Amino acid sequence: MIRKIYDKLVEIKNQIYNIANYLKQEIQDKVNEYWNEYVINHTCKFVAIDGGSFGRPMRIGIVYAVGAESVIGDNKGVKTLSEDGQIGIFKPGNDAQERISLLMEALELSLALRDGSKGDYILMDGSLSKKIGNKVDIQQFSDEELKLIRNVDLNGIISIKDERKMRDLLMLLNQFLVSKIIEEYDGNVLWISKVSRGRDLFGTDYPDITVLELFTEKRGFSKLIIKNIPEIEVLRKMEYTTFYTRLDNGKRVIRVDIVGRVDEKIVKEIMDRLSGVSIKGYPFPLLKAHMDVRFSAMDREKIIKLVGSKLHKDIEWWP
Amino acid sequence: MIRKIYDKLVEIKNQIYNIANYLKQEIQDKVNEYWNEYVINHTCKFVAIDGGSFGRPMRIGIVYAVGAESVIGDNKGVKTLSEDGQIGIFKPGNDAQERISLLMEALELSLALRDGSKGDYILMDGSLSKKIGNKVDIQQFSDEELKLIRNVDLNGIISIKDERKMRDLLMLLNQFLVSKIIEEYDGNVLWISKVSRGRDLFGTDYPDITVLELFTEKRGFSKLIIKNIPEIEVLRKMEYTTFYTRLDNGKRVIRVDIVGRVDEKIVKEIMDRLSGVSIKGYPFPLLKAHMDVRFSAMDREKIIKLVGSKLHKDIEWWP
Ligand SMILES: [Mn+2]
Ligand SMILES: [Mn+2]
Numbered sequence: 001m002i003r004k005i006y007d008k009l010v011e012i013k014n015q016i017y018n019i020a021n022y023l024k025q026e027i028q029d030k031v032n033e034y035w036n037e038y039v040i041n042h043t044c045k046f047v048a049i050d051g052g053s054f055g056r057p058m059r060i061g062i063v064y065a066v067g068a069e070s071v072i073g074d075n076k077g078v079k080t081l082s083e084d085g086q087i088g089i090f091k092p093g094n095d096a097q098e099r100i101s102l103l104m105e106a107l108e109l110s111l112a113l114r115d116g117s118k119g120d121y122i123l124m125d126g127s128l129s130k131k132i133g134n135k136v137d138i139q140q141f142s143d144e145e146l147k148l149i150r151n152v153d154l155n156g157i158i159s160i161k162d163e164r165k166m167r168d169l170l171m172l173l174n175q176f177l178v179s180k181i182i183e184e185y186d187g188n189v190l191w192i193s194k195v196s197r198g199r200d201l202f203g204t205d206y207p208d209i210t211v212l213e214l215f216t217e218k219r220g221f222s223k224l225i226i227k228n229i230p231e232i233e234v235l236r237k238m239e240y241t242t243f244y245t246r247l248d249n250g251k252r253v254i255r256v257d258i259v260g261r262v263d264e265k266i267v268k269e270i271m272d273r274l275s276g277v278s279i280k281g282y283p284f285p286l287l288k289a290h291m292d293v294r295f296s297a298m299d300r301e302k303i304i305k306l307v308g309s310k311l312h313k314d315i316e317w318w319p
Numbered sequence: 320m321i322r323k324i325y326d327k328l329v330e331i332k333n334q335i336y337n338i339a340n341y342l343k344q345e346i347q348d349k350v351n352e353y354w355n356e357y358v359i360n361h362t363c364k365f366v367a368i369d370g371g372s373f374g375r376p377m378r379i380g381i382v383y384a385v386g387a388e389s390v391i392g393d394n395k396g397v398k399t400l401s402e403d404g405q406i407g408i409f410k411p412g413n414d415a416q417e418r419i420s421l422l423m424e425a426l427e428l429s430l431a432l433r434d435g436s437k438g439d440y441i442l443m444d445g446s447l448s449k450k451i452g453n454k455v456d457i458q459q460f461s462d463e464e465l466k467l468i469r470n471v472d473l474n475g476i477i478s479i480k481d482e483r484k485m486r487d488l489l490m491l492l493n494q495f496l497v498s499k500i501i502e503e504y505d506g507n508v509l510w511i512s513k514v515s516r517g518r519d520l521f522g523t524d525y526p527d528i529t530v531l532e533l534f535t536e537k538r539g540f541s542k543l544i545i546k547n548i549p550e551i552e553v554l555r556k557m558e559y560t561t562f563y564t565r566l567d568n569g570k571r572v573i574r575v576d577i578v579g580r581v582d583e584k585i586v587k588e589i590m591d592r593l594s595g596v597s598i599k600g601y602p603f604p605l606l607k608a609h610m611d612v613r614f615s616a617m618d619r620e621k622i623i624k625l626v627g628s629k630l631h632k633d634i635e636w637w638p
Contacts, residue, residue: 001371001618002386002611005404009625013633015408019379020634052320057514059529060338067321085324089334091524092516195376197411205410210378214638292321299320306328314332315339319533 019206023214027202031215034201034223036264039249042272045074047081047119048285049111052293053104054300055090055097062090063307064100067293068107070115073277073285080292081115087303088158095167102170105131106154109177113184121273122181122189123286127196128240128257132178132229133171145169149176150230172232179235187260190270192286196255198242200225212244212253221245221267227257245271251281342533346521350534353520353542355583358568361591364393366400366438367604368430371612372423373619374409374416381409382626383419386612387426389434392596392604399611400434406622407477414486421489424450425473428496431508435500440592441508442605446515447559447576451497451548452490464488468495469549491551498554506579509589511605515574517561519544531563531572540564540586546576564590570600 048071055064067085071078084107090096108124109131116122124131145165148156149172157173160166181189201208201223212222222244229238240259245267246252256270277283295303311318367390374383386404390397403426409415427443428450435441443450464484467475468491476492479485500508520527520542531541541563548557559578564586565571575589596602614622630637 001384001614002388002402002404004402005384005386005406006618006621006625009406009622012407012626012629016379016629016633019408019410020637024636059532060335061525065320065324067324069321083321083323085321087324087328088331089338091338092526092529094516197413206380207411210411213378217638295320299325302325303328306325307331310331310335314335317343318339319536 023204023206023211026204027211028215030202031211035212035216035220036222037218037220038268038271039219041275043075044121044273044276045072045119046121046123046274046277046283046285047072047115048123048125048283048289049108050125050286050289050293051104051108052290052295053100054295055100056300056304057092058304060089060307060311061092062096062100063304064088064090065295065303066100066104066107067295068104068111069289069293070111071285071289071292072115072118073283073288075276078277078285078288081118082111084111085293087307089307091163093163095163099167099170102133102167102174103154103158105174106170106177109174109181110152112181112189113177116181116185116189120188122185123283124189124191125193125286125290126191127193127255128178128191128259129229131174131191132235133174136168136171136175138172140165140168149173152177175232175235176230179231182235182238182259183231187258187262189259190274191257192283193255194252194282198225198255200227200242209244209253209255212246216246216253217250219246219249219271221271224262224267226261243267246281247271247275247278248281254282342523342525342530345523346530347534349521350530354531354535354539355541356537356539357587357590358538360594362394363440363592363595364391364438365440365442365593365596365602365604366391366434367442367444367602367608368427369444369605369608369612370423370427371609371614372419373614374419375619375623376411377623379408379626379630380411381415381419382623383407383409384614384618384622385419385423385426386614387423387430388608388612389430390604390608390611391434391437392602392607394595397596397604397607400437401430402611403430404612406626408626410482412482414482418486418489421452421486421493422473422477424493425489425496428493428500429471431500432496432503435504435508439507441500441504442602443508443510444512444605444609445510446512446574447497447510447578448548449512450493450510451554452493455487455490455494457491459484459487468492471496494551494554495549498550501554501557501578502550506577506581508578509593510576511602512574513571513601517544517574519546519561528563528572528574531565535565535572536569538565538568538590540590543581543586545580562586565600566590566594566597567600573601
């Protein structure tokens with residue numbers, strides 16, 4: 001780093017005060033209007049799914065690894081149910097990082113169908129909007145390619161020649177997989193995120209979730225927001241509900257999306273139940289799922305070493 | 320990481336063999352056709368410029384830091400010339416990482432104008448194509464905004480309200496800055512990259528630069544490729560030359576773009592001169608520039624700590 005930069009900082013006061021003042025005069029009032037304290041709490045099984053992935057640009061191509069885990073938790077305990085993950089190589093390309101992540105999302109969502117029915121609720125890591133992905137051109141696709149979607153053939157989608165088509169087929173797969181989850185599990189799926197760009201509530205330069213963390217402290221929940229978006233088409237008139245909750249005094253606020261109509265009572269029931277498997281304001285089942293699938297710097301080191309050995313072993317003219 | 324995933328890898332032979340053969344049967348022949356050995360080498364001043372940056376999503380916004388450095392090097396030595404860098408905060412946004420990087424590119428290119436004339440050649444880190452950026456909508460811009468471009472007012476461009484306009488104004492600034500560099504320094508600018516997606520040469524699934532690293536060992540250079548792309552308009556009929564060179568037996572291949580026509584003799588002169596400030600196949604002036612501007616994990620830690628103190632000190636209601 002440049003020594004000059006850091007000395008100089010020890011300039012930015014202009015932006016700090018601006019943002020502070022703007023925020024104070026924009027919505028110190030409306031926050032408390034739109035927040036509901038819920039301080040009292042009150043046996044219920046959660047299956048949590050999260051995923052991890054990475055890809056490193058190399059000469060043989062983009063060497064990647066994806067993994068997802070389902071985790072069952074209650075009062076009595078947490079244990080892993082399933083693990084699902086592949087290591088592999090993609091050919092060089094502009095959407096390689098995005099294909100890797102979509103492939104990861106694929107495994108998560110498919111574990112939601114595998115083990116979802118083993119609990120009362122399913123906790124996914126990430127928002128409904130983000131898991132669904134953007135709109136996809138359904139016209140570059142032949143009859144055969146649409147089937148891969150229907151039959152949930154990952155090995156097949158991966159085997160595609162073209163790059164744009166692979167990213168796009170994987171996007172479709174995820175939309176079809178969300179759709180199955182929604183129809184099988186109705187309001188029992190909770191899509192939870194620590195981060196969000198939503199402004200439905202306050203309509204400011206900053207996101208709502210940040211607004212609530214600045215101007216409320218106590219355990220609670222926000223005004224409910226009602227949002228909209230083959231079988232995929234049955235997801236076009238899905239209306240869902242968003243709220244923001246803090247499960248524990250002084251801790252982070254999270255976003256929850258639940259497909260269906262939901263009321264105060266349901267929200268308080270969902271908070272009370274989540275609080276029983278939560279640590280420091282967040283559901284342990286998820287934190288665990290997340291921690292297990294993460295690829296440490298060390299994990300990455302191991303993987304590359306392995307792959308580079310199988311190169312140097314199989315191929316003789318390789319440097 | 321999921322134990323299962325790594326056990327399993329200790330599957331992928333399918334892809335490793337497939338790639339290997341394809342590559343062997345695609346161009347083990349054409350490589351040597353298109354590679355020129357140049358094993359013999361033969362006082363010349365290089366100014367290198369590189370840049371570093373980062374931004375961390377936080378509640379106050381995206382806290383970022385950019386920095387660029389010019390470095391003068393020859394036979395006798397290397398020393399830093401200028402350092403140029405800012406710390407700041409952006410409002411939350413979808414193009415915040417891109418604005419940060421474009422802001423970084425701005426400082427690099429402006430140091431190329433500052434200190435470029437102090438050397439015989441100027442080494443930039445990165446390709447011509449990438450530094451120029453994509454095409455920009457010149458119609459959302461008023462007269463006032465186009466002037467900020469013309470006067471090189473970073474403080475002004477940063478102060479804009481709207482996000483799409485800021486990214487787009489910064490893109491323009493870079494195009495205008497490259498354009499000044501090209502006209503003041505003609506073929507004296509060498510745009511060097513370790514990575515590239517070019518396929519002009521071999522037209523394969525893998526990039527050319529990877530093809531040459533696999534199938535040649537010795538110091539040399541490739542067939543020359545001739546490519547195309549207010550003052551920016553004077554950059555639309557810029558034709559430039561690309562070649563790939565390895566400066567040192569057994570080492571990496573780099574891409575060089577130089578604006579102008581260039582021949583074998585020039586290429587061999589440029590290799591010979593670069594070899595004299597190069598270590599293990601790469602020009603030390605750049606490596607140094609790059610190392611100095613890099614933001615270590617530790618650098619990032621310090622910066623955040625500082626910023627978070629200036630919040631908690633200035634703002635009282637801040638958590
Ligand atoms: Mn995740
Ligand atoms: Mn750089």
